[PDB]
Design a protein around this ligand. Structure first.
Ligand SMILES: O=c1ccn([C@@H]2O[C@H](COP(=O)(O)OP(=O)(O)C[C@H]3O[C@H](CO)[C@H](O)[C@H](O)[C@H]3O)[C@@H](O)[C@H]2O)c(=O)[nH]1
Ligand SMILES: O=c1ccn([C@@H]2O[C@H](COP(=O)(O)OP(=O)(O)C[C@H]3O[C@H](CO)[C@H](O)[C@H](O)[C@H]3O)[C@@H](O)[C@H]2O)c(=O)[nH]1
Ligand SMILES: CCCCCCCCO[C@@H]1O[C@H](CO)[C@H](O)C[C@H]1O[C@@H]1O[C@@H](C)[C@@H](O)[C@@H](O)[C@@H]1O
Ligand SMILES: CCCCCCCCO[C@@H]1O[C@H](CO)[C@H](O)C[C@H]1O[C@@H]1O[C@@H](C)[C@@H](O)[C@@H](O)[C@@H]1O
Ligand SMILES: [Mn+2]
Ligand SMILES: [Mn+2]
Lengths: 288, 288
């Protein structure tokens, strides 16, 4: 449950936070709109686990595995079982055109998986994830989970991804652009697109492969992006990076209440393991 | 309004936040439970003003001026008009035993003041602020304001205090203890008190002179503190720092969603103007 009466935390013994000692001096840990940017060292997971378990939090995880991408499900789900929200209630929603190709993955207690069949297939395909999350699953998600997390399938968990990410609305810093100036961001730059962002605007470049929030906020985001993509289709334009371009426009105009660092979306083959990353949590798998 | 549909921000031109450049390297800007700690340099007030004005936010400010403390009202209110939530809707609630001693202070547009008469007077006096904020003003605050801010009167505003503070629940770092280790904090240490905190617990020492949040969360806090103070009275014990001791116990067990730095509660006569304070926003007036 979100927003409901919160019982007291129990007594806990942990290191005192010290006002004159930053957790991290090498990175920005809060946005200019006072949203935490989540890096290792910024959170005490024991405190957060307590807070979220006291609310009996349920997290939904959506993932699409259409056509050949069903091959990625086994590693995705098996590593999610090792690293994603362990100890919390989790409901996986696997959207696929091949229900029989979903691997039988053994789940920990308090965790469940639903296979949701969708159509095979390009413009309706580009809008598929945003449309599916909003238009068709609206009522189900509201009844079943407190938060939704929406990720790419061509990925594996290598380390902890937990309740530190949960908040009304979050996006994730794209691993290729976190050091870039805004003029270099690959936002949609054509004013004829609903995703248009001028060269003097932009906070961050968020990747389309990991976003989430409360069910209400995720449905707001996905509905807005779906509607904007439909306008573009009607006007004969497709944004340069498809749903990611629209996600970036949305998060510019509706600031996220947390931002995940690139620990949460990394490609080691492409980008190595820089000093600023203490953990590589959720990482690209080769898709050639 | 809180928690309601949020319209898009307009286009804004402002400096890009840079991931590899902290706003502040000299202080902790986020707690281990991912609450921002509000210091100058951590927020873009233009973004925040936009967000809160788009919600037509109304802020209530409670202040008690009983017996000789009515003398502090003129400077308190006149400086609040210069610095507190300017541009936003503000409702001052002045609780006093001398309604006729409230100074006639000229208010900016969209701002109003209500004089609420209370009894003169020691144990019911110690609980007065927490009881008054909870038990008697519950319905009125819910109908009239979105956030409540609860402050001492023996104070003046010298610089901006604005919507950067607003959040479901906040406390303020006590200016005398922000560099102290938790064992040195003047928490109530007797296990016979409801305010008891052992020497190995505690995040911060919050001052009783500036706390706030949403109306719901402030009523939860003030009700809990009032109830705990009544238990102590029944058991023949008064906590070492009265309502502040109880506030500290509450905020240990119910973590605040922002923490205000000592910019927001300072005594220059006692503590000077240290390098870590870029602004002195709300400061002690002599009360001899
Ligand atoms: O045949 C398919 C194709 C895709 N998918 C699904 O879509 C997800 C994104 O695609 P991909 O990972 O290739 O792109 P990335 O380059 O890692 C991710 C980026 O590029 C996309 C276009 O390829 C979009 O622009 C997206 O917005 C952006 O983030 C993929 O993980 C699957 O869950 C599927 O199930 N079957
Ligand atoms: O005759 C009075 C006495 C008080 N008040 C009201 O109470 C507020 C707190 O008291 P004070 O500022 O003296 O204490 P400080 O030392 O600045 C504040 C601290 O000490 C308190 C006891 O004196 C409590 O322990 C409190 O919890 C703690 O923060 C004061 O600002 C007035 O709004 C009033 O209206 N008439
Ligand atoms: C060789 C691939 C170079 C890709 C570098 C930049 O990443 C790409 O950025 C795009 C926006 O400009 C869009 O988000 C797709 C993104 O590529 C994805 O993410 C990368 C980190 C790689 O994993 C890549 O294989 C993947 O397609
Ligand atoms: C001479 C006064 C010394 C006071 C130093 C510490 O401040 C006091 O701390 C108490 C908790 O240990 C409690 O909060 C009261 C507080 O004193 C108030 O705040 C100070 C910063 C001064 O403004 C003081 O005059 C005021 O009474
Ligand atoms: Mn991908
Ligand atoms: Mn005072």
């Amino acid at each position: 449950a979100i927003g409901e009466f919160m019982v007291s935390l129990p007594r806990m013994v942990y290191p005192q936070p010290k006002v004159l000692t930053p957790c991290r001096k090498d990175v920005l840990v809060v946005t200019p709109w006072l949203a935490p940017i989540v890096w290792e060292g910024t959170f005490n997971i024991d405190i957060l686990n307590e807070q979220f378990r006291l609310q009996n939090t349920t997290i939904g995880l959506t993932v699409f595995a259409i056509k050949k991408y069903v091959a990625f499900l086994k590693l995705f789900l098996e590593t999610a079982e090792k690293h994603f929200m362990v100890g919390h209630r989790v409901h996986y929603y696997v959207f696929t055109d091949q229900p029989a190709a979903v691997p039988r993955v053994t789940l920990g207690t308090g965790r469940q998986l639903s296979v949701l069949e969708v159509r095979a297939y390009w413009q309706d395909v580009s809008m598929r994830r945003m449309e599916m999350i909003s238009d068709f699953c609206e009522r189900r998600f509201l009844s079943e989970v407190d938060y939704l997390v929406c990720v790419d399938v061509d990925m594996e968990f290598r380390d902890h991804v937990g309740v530190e990410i949960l908040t009304p609305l979050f996006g994730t810093l794209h691993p290729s652009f976190y050091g870039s100036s805004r003029e270099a961001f690959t936002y949609e730059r054509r004013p004829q697109s609903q995703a248009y962002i001028p060269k003097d605007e932009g906070d961050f470049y968020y990747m389309g492969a990991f976003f989430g929030g409360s069910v209400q906020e995720v449905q707001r985001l996905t509905r807005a992006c779906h509607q904007a993509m439909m306008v573009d289709q009607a006007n004969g334009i497709e944004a340069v990076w498809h749903d990611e371009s629209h996600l970036n426009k949305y998060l510019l105009r509706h600031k996220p209440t947390k931002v995940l660092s690139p620990e949460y979306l990394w490609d080691q083959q492409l980008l190595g393991w820089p000093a600023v990353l203490r953990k590589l949590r959720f990482t690209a798998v080769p898709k050639n």
